[PDB]
């Protein structure tokens, strides 16, 4: 549970209005112990992205187990992403690209992997609806999946851009009414 | 015109492989053929330079949207063209898109952040105006309120542009625009 405690404390600090040393003192350990898990600040943020991706996928998989309807499953995965963003504005800023760190390539590459994993999960759900339920979409599932992912990323971007005033979940019911019409 | 050369050179610096780091007045000075101190005589700060650039982008997009209103009268064809213009503009100006997609250097400065928000508000209002005329032109509206739909359309554009920047410009927004339109049409027809 060592590496997670550090990432948890990192997440907590990002949500407040960061330095390896400051985080070390925060979790209550030497800088050497911290550097053993994350040899550098970039590796630390890279680890935070992985920690976020793993937590989100664990929840997505739970939605897959409990929800059988492919339509509502897409809806829940979207609502989960928007709700998570909304509740973690500091994390959303680094994900949306409004953070300095986004300049670092391996960190950007890493964020891309997280969005691609989410997008893949959406495509998977669409493919199942297509093949198991016989649904015929007006376009390739990859295009529908990109639009769904685009709507989320655009909500997250506007949320940061507006200094966190325009909520990601605002009008989701209305957006979903239009998006779902061609998924149903 | 040493006001346009600076904004022009600035666009290039952001447009070059310098998307990596931050631009400096020094490097910008050399890229314009002058001194740092000489640059600060036209713009009190680098932030004012970015704001002049946002201004340019806004004038460019608003002008192109004005022409769409004049050249196309069908509501859906007008939406298609504005969505296409926004995505096409981003692909033609990768560096400029980085600003609009967000950047620490951009949103930390409250005047530049507000400015970028005005640009998006200008776009959103144009979309809202287009959607609103459908009721009087064809006697019908949309499955959701026009203000909500304008925000949804803008959101898809902002999501595509973010992905474009994030993937280091490997994902091209217009790549499958024709199929994206077939899907969007069916949803809002």
């Amino acid at each position: 549970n060592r590496r997670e405690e550090i990432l948890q404390a990192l997440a907590e600090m990002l949500e407040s209005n960061i330095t390896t040393a400051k985080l070390a003192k925060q979790v209550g350990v030497s800088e050497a112990a911290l550097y053993r898990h994350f040899p550098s600040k970039t590796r630390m943020f890279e680890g935070l992205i992985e920690f976020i991706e793993e937590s989100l996928m664990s929840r997505i998989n739970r939605i897959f187990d409990e929800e059988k309807d492919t339509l509502n499953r897409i809806r829940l995965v979207m609502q989960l992403l928007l709700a998570f963003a909304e509740r973690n504005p500091g994390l959303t800023r680094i994900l949306s690209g409004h953070a300095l760190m986004f300049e670092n390539e391996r960190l950007r590459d890493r964020i891309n992997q997280l969005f691609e994993r989410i997008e893949t999960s959406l495509r998977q759900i669409l493919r199942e609806r297509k093949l198991r339920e016989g649904k015929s979409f007006p376009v390739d599932e990859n295009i529908l999946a990109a639009q769904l992912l685009g709507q989320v990323e655009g909500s997250l971007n506007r949320f940061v851009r507006s200094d966190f005033k325009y909520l990601p979940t605002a009008n989701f019911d209305e957006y979903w009414a239009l998006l779902s019409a061609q998924i149903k």
Side-chain angles (χ1 to χ4, degrees), chain A residues 1-24 26-184:
Chain A
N1 249 248
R2 230 305 164 177
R3 85 134 31 192
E4 286 72 39
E5 297 195 315
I6 290 175
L7 293 181
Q8 275 188 172
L10 205 199
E12 237 48 58
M13 296 176 63
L14 289 167
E15 295 303 335
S16 66
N17 212 307
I18 106 97
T19 49
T20 42
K22 189 151 63 180
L23 181 65
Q26 265 295 0
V27 302
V29 79
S30 76
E31 308 184 32
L34 179 274
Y35 278 112
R36 286 201 283 276
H37 283 269
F38 305 109
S40 82
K41 185 167 337 148
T42 300
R43 305 287 244 294
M44 183 187 284
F45 275 92
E46 206 168 62
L48 172 70
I49 299 313
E50 184 189 288
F51 171 77
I52 291 175
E53 183 180 294
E54 257 54 54
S55 307
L56 260 34
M57 288 309 103
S58 181
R59 294 281 280 79
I60 285 172
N61 271 304
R62 283 174 248 173
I63 286 175
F64 279 19
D65 301 349
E66 287 144 43
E67 184 50 271
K68 68 174 286 66
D69 179 20
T70 45
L71 228 212
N72 199 57
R73 199 136 58 160
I74 287 160
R75 183 178 78 87
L76 294 182
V77 163
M78 285 184 85
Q79 244 172 297
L80 156 74
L81 299 166
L82 298 169
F84 174 71
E86 189 163 293
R87 227 150 317 304
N88 298 274
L91 295 178
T92 308
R93 180 188 292 210
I94 103 194
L95 294 186
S96 69
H98 297 234
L100 224 311
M101 290 301 286
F102 193 68
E103 170 190 0
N104 190 294
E105 197 202 63
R106 62 232 304 290
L107 172 56
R108 196 157 59 243
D109 218 288
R110 193 48 182 88
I111 290 183
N112 287 317
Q113 296 188 305
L114 161 62
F115 282 111
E116 290 182 328
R117 265 248 268 184
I118 301 289
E119 181 170 31
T120 291
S121 297
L122 259 16
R123 277 199 294 237
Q124 284 168 176
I125 298 174
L126 300 180
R127 273 189 304 254
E128 181 180 306
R129 169 154 200 122
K130 172 159 89 287
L131 297 171
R132 308 196 182 188
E133 299 165 59
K135 209 282 189 276
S136 190
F137 297 123
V139 311
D140 189 273
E141 324 88 56
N142 280 18
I143 299 301
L144 237 152
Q147 182 189 227
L148 288 176
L149 182 71
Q151 194 80 75
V152 170
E153 291 196 68
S155 290
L156 310 203
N157 224 254
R158 181 161 190 171
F159 178 47
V160 182
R161 167 159 88 59
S162 70
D163 192 30
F164 310 110
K165 301 292 183 172
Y166 203 92
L167 293 310
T169 63
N171 305 310
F172 177 67
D173 283 347
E174 285 69 39
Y175 286 9
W176 180 245
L178 303 210
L179 294 173
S180 68
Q182 290 299 306
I183 296 180
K184 296 181 195 190

